[PDB]
């Protein structure tokens, strides 16, 4: 996260770290959606241009974390993957369309003060909140700058951007399964996701029921916090049918 701030303790209890076993390193962010299911970006698990194709056994999920590097004894829980599910129409060749993946955990994780699932939006939630100018929140342990690493989880609040503005900022073909967020040059305020924040949640707090919903998944950008560029997010509600199908079949 570029131009964010240190998270408060328990501020993002659904935040998940995807951790590579060997070499031991941060792979991506992710989110907890129930006691056995974790959501992330497909490109965290499968991206042939970079020779990325992880299997279950290559990764661990670490839940309830704050410190990036510390083993948070008595606070974090480390879980093993039972199965990975990548959207079958994930477009890694072109534009990261449908950049979404689910991971089923071997055992349920116990909820705590630091570990708790985020809600997924329904149609009404999406319609009311996914509006230009409405702000959401993005969190992760990714780079602090484009071209280093935070000691603790970082947070930044960013406004959703009008679709014509998103399209005009980029040469990538934008789809309905994506939205963009970030401040414009004239707005003065800054912030963006960066390398290692991928797969992390973009969340909004409903003013109707005061619950946090995951509206987006950190998907792609062009640099980090560059003037005139925006961060792009997987549109969670647009893919909820696939999410539900997977959970209904395999849960």
């Amino acid at each position: 996260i570029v131009e964010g701030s240190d998270a408060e303790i328990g501020m993002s209890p659904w935040q998940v770290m995807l951790f590579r076993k060997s070499p031991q390193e941060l792979l991506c962010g992710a989110s907890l959606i129930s006691d056995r299911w974790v959501l992330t970006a497909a490109h965290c698990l499968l991206y042939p241009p970079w020779d990325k194709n992880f299997t279950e056994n290559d990764l661990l999920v670490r839940i309830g974390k704050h410190s990036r590097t510390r083993y948070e004894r008595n606070i974090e829980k480390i879980s093993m993957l039972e199965k990975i599910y990548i959207h079958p129409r994930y477009n890694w060749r072109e534009n990261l369309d449908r950049d979404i993946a689910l991971m089923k955990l071997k055992k349920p994780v116990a909820f705590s003060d630091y570990i708790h699932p985020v809600c997924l939006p329904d149609r009404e939630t999406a319609a009311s909140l996914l509006q230009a100018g409405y702000k959401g929140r993005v969190t992760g342990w990714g780079n602090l700058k484009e071209t280093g690493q935070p000691s603790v989880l970082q947070v930044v609040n960013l406004p959703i951007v009008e679709r014509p503005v998103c399209k005009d900022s980029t040469r990538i073909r934008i789809t309905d399964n994506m939205f963009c967020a970030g401040y414009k040059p004239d707005e003065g305020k800054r912030g963006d996701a960066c390398e290692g924040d991928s797969g992390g949640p973009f969340v909004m707090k409903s003013p109707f029921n005061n619950r946090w919903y995951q509206m987006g998944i950190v998907s792609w950008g062009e640099g980090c916090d560059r003037d005139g560029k925006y961060g792009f997010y997987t549109h969670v509600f647009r893919l909820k049918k696939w999410i539900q199908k997977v959970i209904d079949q395999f849960g």
């Binding site: 390193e25 590097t69 510390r70 083993y71 093993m80 690493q149």
Partner: peptide
């Protein structure tokens, strides 16, 4: 710079 995690994992 990651601290080692328990062997159980």
């Amino acid at each position: 710079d990651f601290e080692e995690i328990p062997g159980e994992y």
